[PDB]
Ligand binder design. Sequence first.
Ligand SMILES: CC(=O)N[C@H]1[C@@H](O[C@H]2[C@@H](O)[C@@H](CO)O[C@@H](O)[C@@H]2O[C@@H]2O[C@@H](C)[C@@H](O)[C@@H](O)[C@@H]2O)O[C@H](CO)[C@H](O)[C@@H]1O
Length: 389
Amino acid sequence: EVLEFYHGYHHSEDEWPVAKTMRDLYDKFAEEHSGVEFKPTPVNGDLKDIMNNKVASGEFPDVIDLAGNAVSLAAIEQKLVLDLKPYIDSNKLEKNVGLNYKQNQKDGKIYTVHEQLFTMGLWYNKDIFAKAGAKTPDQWNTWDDFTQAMASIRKQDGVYAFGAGEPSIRLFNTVLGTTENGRKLLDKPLTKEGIESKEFADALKMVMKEIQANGSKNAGGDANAYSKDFQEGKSAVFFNGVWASGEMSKNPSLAPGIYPAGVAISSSGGGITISSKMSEAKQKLALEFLKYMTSDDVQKVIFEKVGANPSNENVNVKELSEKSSEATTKILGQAITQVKNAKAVVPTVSDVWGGDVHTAIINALTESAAENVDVDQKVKSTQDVLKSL
Ligand SMILES: CC(=O)N[C@H]1[C@@H](O[C@H]2[C@@H](O)[C@@H](CO)O[C@@H](O)[C@@H]2O[C@@H]2O[C@@H](C)[C@@H](O)[C@@H](O)[C@@H]2O)O[C@H](CO)[C@H](O)[C@@H]1O
């Protein structure tokens, strides 16, 4: 028997050393293991496609690491996915899964566990801000402070303010969390009245206006294609998580911050997700793999080698940052501490409202960058699109 494990760590160690570290973690589990063999399969392209193509025709990949992506809602309805909570309970792994335990709980059931937490503030270039005379992220008490800082930076040439596209939903996600009503919207699945909802409409409009001011030229991509520009000093701010630290530590000009009014993103994300339709032996090896990726020793590697925030609460991130000589581990701990000490913390749209709502909002924010789009009627048509899904 073969247990197929799909992940997105396909990168050569020369393009992203983290991928190689992860792959070393996986086939070390394979060598550790009986009558069922573990087979890691690195996916080049969309991980959601592997899942969704199997969900159609009523199946599921044996094991998939969704890497922050949300579980298919159709997969849960058809119970293509195993409930992980009994095994966690049961093997005393509440602390090992950390934030996943409460946040990935859907009616007392856990369908996915992310070994790396979706801990997300933002990144900014200290030199570009200083030169523009722009308020740094710690000075952004309101949305208007952020937009005024962005306007100042655009008065300089050679640099654009920020990358828009996928990163622009992080602005929507956090600006919604600026009021109590917006925060409770992100506590439940999305409803028609929630879409409509002055807070939902205002957030949409604020961000779209800023994305349009940011320029249509600067909305053609995802976070991965904006990272290079930021490392090279071509942009002022970069909306990505703490896990960016390894790529970020190379340029000492760039620093962690969080979003206006002291808001940060703190969610689990989708992670290790396992099929319901397997023999007893490969189901228990798959749960053994969850146990492994979530163990004390692996999570130390998750923090120290992989520059990410571990799900395991037994790993002392601060003390490890304390005793490290690594620049990566230093700003990693700094970035995590900022999110942990945010005035308000929100989950990702993807986690709470699902992958479809995530994608629809990203598309609408991207489309709004076009110079000929009226923001008011775009907001209205965006909320028209959300109600239908
Ligand atoms: C769902 C989502 O918004 N994912 C974005 C995000 O993903 C990264 C985080 O989930 C991080 C947590 O520490 O783990 C990273 O592995 C993950 O990166 C992505 O997934 C892995 C498996 C690889 O395929 C990576 O190349 C891929 O980026 O952040 C990235 C940018 O850092 C993207 O915006 C993702 O869309």
